[PDB]
Design a binder for these strands. Structure first.
Ligand SMILES: [Zn+2]
Lengths: 159, 31, 126, 396, 58, 48, 50
RNA sequence: AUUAGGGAUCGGACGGCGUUUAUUUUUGACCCGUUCGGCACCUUACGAUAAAUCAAAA
């Protein structure tokens, strides 16, 4: 593809190979995929979160099959938050990063709050149908967006 | 007469019409 | 149909400043309206506003502004012309502001004096 | 209703434009400061009113916040930041001797009862707190994931180390200072404009909200509101508790000022003046006999409470007479005749027709809800009481 | 009209209420001491500054 | 220049739509002479 | 998780606050149920024990 | 850019504590709530202005 491996690039590659073999009985987007990309930077304090970059047909491939896959990869891989993201190289690309980063939920709104001075902030508010399994991951979504892009956006469910 | 209206032209709602002669009349007063 | 969406927004703010509301829902949005609002918030004549999307803007207004207006012919102006234009457009030189699209962006007449940039009068408020 | 002549006076020239913030000397008895829309503060004595005592062009934009310290100095907030001046010095210094800008746009100020500490509600969704003479940047405490601009902030005097506050998320929030953290966040149906506490009942507190309504809560339990004081037309701009804590000033966005008992559920008094233009800051003085209304007409008007009960020492039978009439009312207030000529108060046309429309529309809404309940499956449920119904949600 | 049409809100029985008032309050029908006691306001405010309470009393 | 308290009051008696003129009046740098009567009636204040 | 952690921390803080308010509930109860309230309070008279 | 909504008006479309069709499901008639769309009343003007014209000559 485009890289020479790293210590956890080989780890995530051998992970998806031991998802090739000795498991399910579910096999859709795993075999036509090779090493694509992976990245690891601190989130919060004391905790980490892995992100894995994937090509654009494999995006909707993983959108067909991503339920319980992130779950098992989180459980047997380092007990940490797994995020799946495209590899790209401006604002439409940033909205693409947003809607790729939030996989089970469709966002509802982007909210640009100006203040009493020229300071501004963004708030993206998500769907109401799924709330329970995200609030422990919302901060991780926010910090990985802040590290990959650099813009300060906060993620919330409206009330 | 309302005191808030400027006198350079006429106002419809939030729209101020200024004819070319009035802006040229300002172009006379600046010189 | 009025193609000046910023004029429709200024009319909305004028009617809300007359009837005394505390917010509005300006349905068609534009970046120039955003910039006018930022100058408005610099001079504190509006409380706080948020751009929301389908978009529109919620504009919480305090009740300090009196009247909004747009110069439709979008008139080009130089420095001495800026001073004389602002003295014939606002009721007092120590009240209200006019808006310019200069080469340095969109700002009021005091900022255009600080940068010494001339430009094009578009709108005003008090 | 003959002797109801409640207006008293107009504090000096007033500011230039509208008056947006003001604050008292919570220690002495006569010292008032208010900051304008044009970035200037004035400090007034109550005994000599026709002229200002002290004046300084503080900021550029409107003077959002203002308060007195304990010792002699005072502090003003705006978009420039916050600064500390001294009004009572043998020289009139114009230069403020302290300043702060970091922490984003501050909204509001509040100063501690006993100590030299004070808190500031910023725009950054965060309150930062200084301890004077040995702190510089202060502690920035906030809800963990919070952005929205916190508007009001108030030191609770009776139980110290406790400060409640409120943001534009239509939520209010409670904090602690011994363990420096937020405590509770509760979200309402509508946006609140200001929070104060009940200075004689520590667990009780007060929010003024753009639902035209005032809500009293117990801090220990936000399950239902303790008191719904509803009388208004437009948004309520500010509330303050009487120092006796049984009475309440409510200045609202319409040109009215409504004077309240603590348990009422309706007005005791309404004040209106065709001069007065918008209300923004209403504070009792330290006496619970006079309230002060800070206008956007640029006036600081001085009104009396006890709408007829003139000040002055009283001869024995004079006060026996007036107490006699008072308790005489507290028996016979509910007869129709005397009730109508105690409730009869003339209102200006605007607020009159507006409250006609409001009562009509709320009757329509209730009829909607009743028909829907009767012709829906909600009929087999309890009528949820309104002091319950006011809260949207509570969380921690 | 000198009747009272609706029950007063603290009350629960007409007989409670009609027997609750029951007593003239002025100086013509009771002693001056009972007058003082019967017209005393619930709250009394002197001159001064009501600084909010420092120590919880009871 | 001098403005009477009656004049100031009459301006404020004119509604919010006169706010600019009100502020113009209330610009500080001019003397303010009071009145002591009941009227707040500009013309009589002036003539007296 | 940081969320539940700060939740329980602020919950304990809330408990302590409610304890500190329970130290005032008795006085509040008294004054709201009492016959006659005096103002300003005897405790906050500036010349107390002289 | 709305007045400011209510009381009614019908044209859909949506729902339902329910009566009658219904021998029980449709479905239709009565009632309620939501929604757009409009023939029109009144209220207050948001003002006006050339007045006899107005929810428009705002
Ligand atoms: Zn006079």
């Amino acid at each position: 593809s485009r890289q020479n491996p790293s210590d956890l690039e080989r780890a995530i590659a051998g992970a998806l190979y031991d998802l090739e073999t000795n498991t399910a009985d579910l096999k859709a987007a795993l075999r036509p995929l090779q090493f694509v990309s992976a990245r690891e930077i601190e989130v919060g304090h004391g905790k980490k979160a892995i992100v894995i970059f994937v090509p654009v047909p494999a995006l909707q491939g993983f959108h067909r099959v991503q339920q319980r896959l992130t779950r098992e990869l989180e459980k047997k891989f380092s007990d940490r938050h797994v995020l799946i993201l495209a590899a790209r190289r401006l604002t439409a690309v940033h909205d693409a990063i947003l809607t790729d980063l939030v996989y089970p939920v469709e966002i509802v709104g982007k909210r640009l709050r100006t203040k009493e001075d020229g300071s501004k902030v963004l708030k993206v508010i998500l769907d109401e149908k799924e709330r329970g399994g995200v609030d422990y991951r919302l901060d991780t979504y926010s910090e990985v967006y802040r590290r990959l892009t650099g813009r300060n956006v906060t993620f919330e469910f409206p009330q | 007469r309302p005191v808030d209206l400027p006198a350079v032209g006429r106002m419809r709602g939030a729209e101020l019409r200024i004819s070319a002669k009035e802006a040229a009349a300002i172009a006379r007063e600046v010189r | 149909v009025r193609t000046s969406v910023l004029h429709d927004a200024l009319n909305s703010i004028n009617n809300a400043e007359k009837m005394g509301k505390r917010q509005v829902m300006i349905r068609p949005s534009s970046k120039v309206i955003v910039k006018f609002l930022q100058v408005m918030q610099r001079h504190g004549y509006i409380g706080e506003f948020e751009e929301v999307d389908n978009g529109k803007i919620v504009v919480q207004l305090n009740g300090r502004l009196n009247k909004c207006g747009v110069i439709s012919p979008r008139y080009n102006v130089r420095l001495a012309e800026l001073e004389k234009w602002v003295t014939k457009l606002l009721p007092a030189r120590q009240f209200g502001y006019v808006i310019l699209t200069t080469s340095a962006g969109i700002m009021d007449h005091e900022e255009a004096r600080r940068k010494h940039v001339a430009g094009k009068i578009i709108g005003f408020f008090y | 209703r003959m002797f109801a002549k409640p207006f008293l006076g107009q504090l000096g020239n007033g500011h230039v434009q509208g008056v947006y913030s003001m604050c008292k000397d919570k220690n002495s008895l006569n010292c008032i400061a208010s900051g304008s829309g044009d970035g200037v503060v004035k400090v007034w004595d109550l005994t000599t009113r026709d002229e200002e005592t002290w004046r300084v062009a503080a900021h550029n934009n409107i003077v959002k916040g203002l308060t007195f310290t304990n010792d002699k100095k005072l502090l003003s907030c705006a978009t420039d930041g916050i600064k500390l001046w001294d009004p009572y010095a043998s020289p009139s210094n114009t230069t403020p001797i302290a300043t702060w800008q970091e922490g984003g746009p501050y909204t509001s100020l509040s100063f501690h009862r006993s100590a030299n500490t004070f808190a500031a509600s910023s725009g950054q969704g965060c309150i930062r707190i200084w301890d004077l003479e040995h702190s510089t940047a202060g502690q920035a405490i906030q809800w963990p994931s919070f952005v929205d601009t916190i508007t009001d902030v108030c030191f609770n005097q009776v139980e110290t180390s406790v400060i409640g506050s409120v943001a534009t998320d239509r939520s209010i929030i409670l904090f602690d200072l011994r363990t420096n953290m937020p405590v509770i966040k509760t979200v309402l149906h509508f946006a609140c404009n200001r929070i104060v506490f009940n200075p004689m009942e520590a667990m009780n507190l007060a929010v003024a909200s753009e639902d035209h309504n005032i809500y009293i809560f117990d801090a220990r339990n936000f399950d239902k509101a303790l008191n719904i004081q509803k009388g208004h037309v437009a948004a309520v701009m500010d509330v303050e508790f009487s120092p006796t804590g049984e009475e309440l000033v409510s200045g609202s966005y319409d040109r009215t000022i409504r004077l309240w008992r603590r348990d009422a559920g309706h007005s005791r008094d309404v004040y209106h003046t065709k001069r007065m233009q918008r209300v923004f800051r209403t504070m009792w003085t330290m006496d619970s006999k006079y309230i002060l209304t800070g206008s956007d007409d640029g006036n600081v008007r001085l009104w009396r409470a006890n709408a007829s009960e003139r000040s002055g020492v009283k001869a024995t039978r004079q006060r026996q007479a007036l107490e006699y009439n008072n308790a005489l009312l507290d028996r016979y207030g509910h007869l129709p005749e005397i009730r109508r000529i105690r409730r009869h108060r003339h209102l200006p046309k605007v607020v009159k027709k507006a409250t006609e429309i409001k009562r009509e529309e709320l009757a329509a809404i209730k009829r909607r809800e009743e028909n829907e309940r009767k012709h829906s499956n909600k009929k087999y449920e309890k009528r949820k009481s309104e002091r319950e119904k006011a809260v949207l949600v509570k969380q921690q | 009209k000198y009747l009272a049409t609706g029950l007063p809100h603290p009350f629960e029985s007409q007989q409670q209420y009609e027997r609750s008032l029951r007593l003239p309050v002025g100086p013509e029908w009771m002693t001056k001491e009972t007058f003082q006691d019967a017209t005393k306001p619930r709250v009394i405010i002197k001159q001064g500054i009501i600084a909010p309470m420092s120590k919880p009393m009871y | 220049i001098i403005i009477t308290s009656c004049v100031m009051a009459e301006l404020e008696k004119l509604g919010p739509r006169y706010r600019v003129a009100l502020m113009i009046a209330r610009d500080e740098r001019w003397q303010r002479l009071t009145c002591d009567h009941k009227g707040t009636y500009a013309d009589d204040c002036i003539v007296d | 998780a940081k969320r539940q952690q700060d939740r329980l921390m602020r919950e304990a803080a809330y408990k302590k606050t409610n304890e500190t308010l329970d130290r005032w509930i008795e006085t509040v109860k008294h004054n709201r149920r009492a016959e006659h309230l005096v103002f300003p309070l005897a405790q906050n008279a500036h010349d107390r024990g002289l």
